Homo-oligomer: A and B are copies of this chain.
């Protein structure tokens, strides 16, 4: 039997230039797996050094030390294949709900590198090791193209405007459709002398005046690339509505939650939007109730800040009838075991799940494997530039090819266009 023998960790930079860690788990046979940990811009504790003379306080040398001095003794000798056991051991070694003692980034690095070490030991694909023999669904992506809100200096209230290449027969064709719309948009922006520098996700933040102008521009880009909105490519939003919710007044840039729901409803009547993420604030439970009752029969309603990949919040959301899809960000919770339990709890209640990148990503592509492992049918992993995004699409295309006739590209949005 193959057991954990050592764990190495080192400090790298993420795609924004800030430190994070990569972790290598090594078995007693000399097999190993390596994974790196992303980071967002309210969740499991990302442990930073706070040394002001180093990376403005964002080093992760202490988390690395926790991997090497705490998790190594806690895990060595245990089977490389007992994923749930290893994750429980780390959760207990930390002892706190939010992983604030050892660092959720230290624990997630080990959690992912361990699964890969086991898969590499069996010489089996990670998605098959994690998801079993019937892992076979390639996800329909939601692809960022235009940014606003807190992610821009334009007049867009909402944070992200995405396309979904819903008519693609394959993931690789979904990628091409996305890339061609991206190229048409880039050229449209150049022709309009609007900014073409890209943001964290690899899409654009031109100076547009309103959510509707952004939606119109994506429609123009779709058609210019030669595709039909609604039939070939639909739209999705991330409002990140907490960003413009006044908790004292209970208003969204002056509007009641009922007004805000009316605004989203009108957009959905006039645009081929089939998914809305965080349309109301994370704690506006009456708003979410009205949003779910008003559009939950017609459009995918995704909780991101509402759920934070957290099984307790998901269960409370489902009991109250809120939303119909869950964003899954493994580092928000900190182990694969808890990520899987979030996915299972949502899926058996009829919710879709969507594997998601973070704004600070790395060259690690685990979330592509996780999306296939759990047959989620959806992923959210960025625009069509910058290799910390593209590498996930490249990994999905490799998975689809490796699976040959077993692959199925299949959107899990219940309400597709």
Residue pair A386, B384 in contact (C-beta under 8 Å): no
A56 interface residue per 8 A CB criterion: yes
For A56, the chain B residues whose CB sits under 8 A away are: 180, 183
Q: How far is the CB of A21 from chain B (nearest CB, A)?
A: 11
Residue pair B393, A183 in contact (C-beta under 8 Å): no
Measured in the bound complex, the distance between the Cα atoms of B362 and A390 in whole Å is 9
Stretch at the interface among A39-47, A91-99, A277-285, A394-402: A394-402
A217 interface residue per 8 A CB criterion: no
Of B175, B182, B197, B393, which contacts A196 at CB under 8 A? B197
CB contact under 8 A between A401 and B197, given known A15-B385, A176-B54, A387-B391: no
Residue pair B15, A393 in contact (C-beta under 8 Å): no
Residue pair A198, B195 in contact (C-beta under 8 Å): no
Q: Please, what's the 1-or-0 string for A12-29, where 1 marks a CB less than 8 Å from any CB in chain B?
A: 111111100010000000
CB contact under 8 A between A13 and B384, given known A179-B55, A363-B363, A363-B394: yes
A361 interface residue per 8 A CB criterion: yes
Q: Please, what's the 1-or-0 string for A182-217, where 1 marks a CB less than 8 Å from any CB in chain B?
A: 110000000001011111000011000000000000
Residue pair A17, B401 in contact (C-beta under 8 Å): no
For A195, the chain B residues whose CB sits under 8 A away are: 195, 197
CB contact under 8 A between A10 and B204, given known A17-B179, A387-B361: no
Interface size class of A (residues with CB under 8 A): 35 or more
Residue pair B15, A386 in contact (C-beta under 8 Å): yes
Residue pair B15, A176 in contact (C-beta under 8 Å): no
Residue pair A17, B176 in contact (C-beta under 8 Å): no
Q: Please, what's the 1-or-0 string for A158-187, where 1 marks a CB less than 8 Å from any CB in chain B?
A: 000000000000001001100110110000
A274 interface residue per 8 A CB criterion: no
Output the residue of A176, A197, A384, A394 with the most chain B CB within 10 A. Answer: A197
- CB closest residue in chain B, given A207: B195
Of B11, B196, B386, B393, which contacts A387 at CB under 8 A? B386
A388 interface residue per 8 A CB criterion: yes
Measured in the bound complex, the distance between the Cα atoms of B411 and A136 in whole Å is 49
Output the residue of A198, A397, A398 with the most chain B CB within 10 A. Answer: A198
Q: How far is the CB of A61 from chain B (nearest CB, A)?
A: 11
For A175, the chain B residues whose CB sits under 8 A away are: 13
Measured in the bound complex, the distance between the Cα atoms of B175 and A55 in whole Å is 10
Measured in the bound complex, the distance between the Cα atoms of B12 and A179 in whole Å is 11
- CB closest residue in chain B, given A16: B385
Measured in the bound complex, the distance between the Cα atoms of B198 and A398 in whole Å is 28
Q: Please, what's the 1-or-0 string for A377-417, where 1 marks a CB less than 8 Å from any CB in chain B?
A: 00000001111101101100110010000000000000000
Q: How far is the CB of A192 from chain B (nearest CB, A)?
A: 12
Contact surface of A with B, Cβ cutoff 8 Å: 10-18, 22, 54-56, 153, 172, 175-176, 179-180, 182-183, 193, 195-199, 204-205, 361-363, 384-388, 390-391, 393-394, 397-398, 401
Given pairs A195-B195, A197-B199, A388-B388, 17 additional interface contacts (CB within 8 A) = A11-B172, A15-B385, A15-B387, A16-B385, A17-B179, A17-B183, A54-B176, A153-B193, A197-B197, A197-B205, A362-B387, A362-B391, A363-B394, A386-B387, A386-B388, A387-B387, A387-B388
Closest 3 CB pairs of A and B: A197-B197, A387-B388, A17-B384
